[PDB]
Every structure is written in C-alpha cells, then in structure tokens.
Amino acid sequence: TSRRWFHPNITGVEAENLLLTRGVDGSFLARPSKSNPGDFTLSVRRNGAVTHIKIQNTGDYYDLYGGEKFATLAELVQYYMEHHGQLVIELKYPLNCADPTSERWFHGHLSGKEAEKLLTEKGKHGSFLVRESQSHPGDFVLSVRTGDSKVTHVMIRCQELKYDVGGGERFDSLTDLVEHYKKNPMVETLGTVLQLKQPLNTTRINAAEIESRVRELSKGFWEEFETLQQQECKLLYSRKEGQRQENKNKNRYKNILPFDHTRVVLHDGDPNEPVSDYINANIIMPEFKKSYIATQGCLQNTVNDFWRMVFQENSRVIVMTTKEVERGKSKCVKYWPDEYALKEYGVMRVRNVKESAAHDYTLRELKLSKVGQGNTERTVWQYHFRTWPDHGVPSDPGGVLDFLEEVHHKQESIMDAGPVVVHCSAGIGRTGTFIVIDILIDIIREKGVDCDIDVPKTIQMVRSQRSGMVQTEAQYRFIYMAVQHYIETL
Ligand SMILES: Cc1nc(N2CCC3(CC2)CO[C@@H](C)[C@H]3N)cc(=O)n1-c1cccc(Cl)c1Cl
C-alpha cells in the first residue's frame, strides 16, 4: 500500500516545520524517538498547529496514549484513516518521507568494488542496489545484474534536490526514481533491459558466520530492523471474522485480531451457540515439520474455546511466556486447574497431574479429555516461563535457550503431536520472539552449523501469518543473540 508517512531520522522540531510548511490540516506522520528505543510519535496538524501523540511499545504492542493498542504502525493508521476513534483528530493526508535508509535496495556508503563483489557472488538476474556515489560528491549509483551475465552501472545525479539518470524525469526522492524504473525498465541501445526484479540480498548468512554479523550490526541493528519494519505495509490482510460483533469480546485487545487466512477455526461447536468457531489464534507454518499456534492470553470467557483448540488441533505442548498479571493489569486468566485437581471447561476436562518448578519456568503435566467418550485423555505439557521481564527483553539468552531446548525434546518424544501452542499477552511480541527463535534453531539442528539463516526473512514469513510477530528492536536483536548463543555452545 504505502507507509511513507513514517520518517525514521527526524526529530520533534523537524516534524513540526515539515507539517507547518509542506503540509496542511489533515497531514500526519509517524517517527521514532532517536533517543530512547520503543517510543514513537504521531505528529498530526490540526487547526494550523501540530499535535504530537505518543506511542509506547515495551515489547507487547503499540500503545497509543488516549487511544487503543495495535499490532503494527500500519494497522494503526489504517484503523484511524477509516474511522474516527481518535479524539477529534483527522488522518487525511500522509506526509511522505524521502529518506531512503529503510529501503531494502539502498546500501548507503558502499564502494564500487564491494558492490560488484556482492552482485557477482550473491546476485541473480534482476538483482539491484542503490549506493552513494564513489567518485562524485553526493550523487548515487545504481547497479543492476542481468543474465542467469554482467553488471551494469547507472549513475544518478542530484540536481537541485532532484534525482535523475541524466535524462528524462527529475524525481523528488530516490524511491520515486527506483519505483518508476521498476515500472519502466531502462532499455540499453542494444536490447539489454535493466530489469529491477528484487533488491540484492545482504542479510542471508551462513549459520557459522553469525558472530561476525552481530559484530557488524553492533557498530546496524536499528537500520536493518526498520528496513524490515517498512515492509509491514504488504501485510495488511483481512481480519473480518475478528471484527464481527459476536467476536468483539473474545479478543483480549479490541484491534489485535487474527488474519483470516491463518486463523484457527473451532470445529464441532455447540449447535445452540449461534457463533462458536472463533478464537484469537493463528496457524504458524515454517518455511512458508513442527507447527505452532500463536494465540492470546485467555480471557475468562475464552478458556472453554482455548481448550477446544488444544483438543481439536491435537496439541501436546503449551508455551506460556507471561505471568497471569504483569504491571498490575491482567495478561492471562488461570486457564489451568490447581495441582492434583480436576476441572471441567465446558465440553473439555483437564486434570493437573504434577507441577515441576525449575529456575526459569514451571512445568505443568496436564491430562486433557473430552466429556463423554472414555479414550480421549492426552498429556499436555505446559511450559510456563516466569523470568520474562515486564519491560525490555532478557539480557542473557541462555535462560530462554535452555527453555526451548526442553520444549523441543518433549515435542519430539510425542507421536503425531499437533502444533505447539504459544501465547503471551497479545500473543504477537514475546510469542513471536519464541517462534522465530525456535524456527531458526530448528534449522540449525537438521543442517548443522554450516547452513543459511535469514532472520528478517523468517520474521517476515511469520508476520504474514499473524499481525506484528516480533514487536521491538530489542526482541529483534535478542533473536540474533539467541541464535548466536546457540551456535557458540557447539
Ligand atoms: C531486513 C532487511 N534489510 C536489508 N538491508 C540492510 C540495511 C540497508 C539495506 C539492505 C543497508 O543500510 C541501511 C541504510 C539499509 N538500507 C535488505 C533486506 O532485504 N531485508 C529483508 C530480508 C527479508 C524479508 C524482508 Cl520484509 C526484508 Cl525488508
């Protein structure tokens, strides 16, 4: 769609003078605080003045002050441009940004013998990249590879705040120049067409060389994460069944809803309950062989539906990464019985066989059966992580890594076990960090230390199945630290 209203490298003062000079009433934009990560601002001009609106994300959701909670900054703006629930404030005209730092083809300061190096070794027909001019003062050079082969270089000028290739149109930003020639490829005089199929991959690395990449990104991480965050715009899938009136009080958060293409559909429902097929949960498929279900912390009215999912999907392990109450607010109601006790959750029956307390988690062996038939009893192993902080992320990955290693071996011991149910508060942040780590680790086991891993490609592949998997840069960097830690221990 768009998402050009997000300006990554502007301050509070600059956002005003932009909206005050190059905008009108209804203009808006989002920006991160360069100072402290996790904080974002929504600058909207109304009645000749600008109105800044703070957005906080500690690792679970984007909390709009005086508003609601959303999964992505795209779904936030999309919800308000098509509504009014923001008091009123109007999001009419998005003030686009020209800074190409978050573009996946722009590689900033990059020389020519390095550019040909990556294009020849890792490129294919259509690979391209934009870089600052290594010859000139402040211009840019486009490099395109075509074949199965050659590498054509196209010089881009900067003439009075406009970019051009030495003839034709003068574009206001590098993106408009790139996006134009991805729509109208430059054709050389001898038939060679400069096709811009896909940007050059630079994030795909061998699993062995993981420490050196973490060494580079720490000089890096913020630039690559926001580059991935800019691609959240192509993930605005439908959430109809979640927005239905009958399902409004089944979501822990009003506007954190499951995608309609991967939502878990509750079958075998009550014929007297008019609507009993919905639950805030999504199917998670890797390389999209171990599957997942990213769901939310159970409300008091969703416990029966939650257990219906664990039964209908033949799940055997539940990974919970939140305390029942954090920061004084409710994150998840106790959906399991007390130890040595037996409870009925509608049509499902659950017995707490034994509870085992470790350093960083509690293990609850549970007995799940359906009321009626005698042979439906199955063992469900709940791994309730407790040492995850309310803010930020764990500083050392060794804690969560031992956690996932015990969860993996339990899943491997069970025959035809269903998908692993993971959930935190909203079931997108901490839950997403687990699944991505468990997905990347699961690759290292089968292929070894010498294999390809693509942290952003995996996260993007998971976000296309549930809104906003992995929330903050902290979780993004933590995943890198988690993968790196797993490989140093070999
Ligand atoms: C996350 C990511 N970062 C890429 N770069 C790193 C950063 C630069 C550009 C190159 C280079 O310096 C910076 C100015 C930035 N401009 C390239 C890239 O392809 N991904 C990606 C991978 C898989 C799935 C998705 Cl959705 C995405 Cl976005």
- Please classify residue 490 by burial: count the beta carbons closer than 10 Å to its beta carbon, then call 0-12 exposed, 13-18 middle and 19+ buried: exposed
- Please classify residue 269 by burial: count the beta carbons closer than 10 Å to its beta carbon, then call 0-12 exposed, 13-18 middle and 19+ buried: middle
**How many whole angstroms separate alpha carbon 126 and alpha carbon 197?**
4
Q: Is 203 in the pocket of ligand 1 (CB under 6 A)?
A: yes
> Residue 424, annotated ligand binder?
yes
> Residue 127, annotated ligand binder?
no
Q: 12-94 belongs to which homologous superfamily?
A: SH2 domain (3.30.505.10)
Cα-to-centroid distance, 468 and ligand 1 (Å): 17
Q: Is 460 in the pocket of ligand 1 (CB under 6 A)?
A: yes
Q: At what angle do helices 398-413 and 473-488 cross, to 10 degrees?
A: 70
Q: Integer distance in angstroms from the first to the last C-alpha of the chain?
A: 44
Which tokens hold the place of 115? 């550019």
- Paired strand residues for 227: none
- The residues of the chain that CATH labels 3.90.190.10 are 216-489
Q: Is 362 in the pocket of ligand 1 (CB under 6 A)?
A: no
Contact 155, 176 (CB under 8 A): no
How far is the CA of 209 from the CAs of 57, 203, 441, 453, 485, in angstroms? Answer: 31, 12, 15, 10, 12
> Residue 341, annotated ligand binder?
no
> Residue 390, annotated ligand binder?
yes
Q: Is 108 in the pocket of ligand 1 (CB under 6 A)?
A: yes
b or e along 79-104 (b: 16 or more beta carbons within 10 Å of the residue's beta carbon)?
A: bbeeeeebeebbbebbbbbeebebbb
User: Which secondary-structure segment (H or E) carries 463?
Assistant: helix 455-463
Q: Is 297 in the pocket of ligand 1 (CB under 6 A)?
A: no
> Residue 428, annotated ligand binder?
yes
Place of tokens 């013998």: 113
Mutate to test the pocket of ligand 1, among 175, 228, 452 (most ligand atoms within 8 A of CB): 228
List residues with catalytic annotation: 424
Contact 106, 100 (CB under 8 A): yes
Cα-to-centroid distance, 453 and ligand 1 (Å): 14
Cα-to-centroid distance, 51 and ligand 1 (Å): 32
**How many whole angstroms separate alpha carbon 420 and alpha carbon 295?**
11
What are the CB-based long-range contacts (under 8 Å, 24+) for 443-451?
443/207, 444/207, 444/483, 444/486, 444/487, 447/207, 448/207, 449/207, 449/208, 449/487, 449/490, 450/206, 450/207, 450/208, 451/206, 451/207
Mutate to test the pocket of ligand 1, among 9, 203, 465 (most ligand atoms within 8 A of CB): 203
Q: Is 100 in the pocket of ligand 1 (CB under 6 A)?
A: no
Task: Report the structure determination method.
Answer: X-ray
Q: 216-489 belongs to which homologous superfamily?
A: Protein tyrosine phosphatase superfamily (3.90.190.10)
Protein residue with its CA nearest to atom 11 in ligand 1: 107
- Work out which ligand 1 atom sits closest to the CA atom of 201: 19
Which is nearest to 396 in space by CA: 487, 483, 482?
A: 482
**How many whole angstroms separate alpha carbon 258 and alpha carbon 217?**
32
- Please classify residue 409 by burial: count the beta carbons closer than 10 Å to its beta carbon, then call 0-12 exposed, 13-18 middle and 19+ buried: exposed
Strand order from edge to edge, sheet including 39-46: 69-70, 62-64, 49-56, 39-46, 27-32, 93-94
Which is nearest to 470 in space by CA: 456, 483, 454, 482?
A: 456
Q: Is 198 in the pocket of ligand 1 (CB under 6 A)?
A: no
Cα-to-centroid distance, 107 and ligand 1 (Å): 9
Contact 152, 194 (CB under 8 A): yes
Protein residue with its CA nearest to atom 12 in ligand 1: 107
Protein residue with its CA nearest to atom 19 in ligand 1: 104
- Paired strand residues for 32: 40
- Work out which ligand 1 atom sits closest to the CA atom of 457: 23
- The residues of the chain that CATH labels 3.30.505.10 are 12-94
Which letter does DSSP use for residue 230 in this model? G
Which tokens hold the place of 390? 């309310």
**How many whole angstroms separate alpha carbon 404 and alpha carbon 410?**
10
Protein residue with its CA nearest to atom 17 in ligand 1: 104
Q: Give the angle 408-409-410 at the CA atoms, nearest 5°.
A: 90
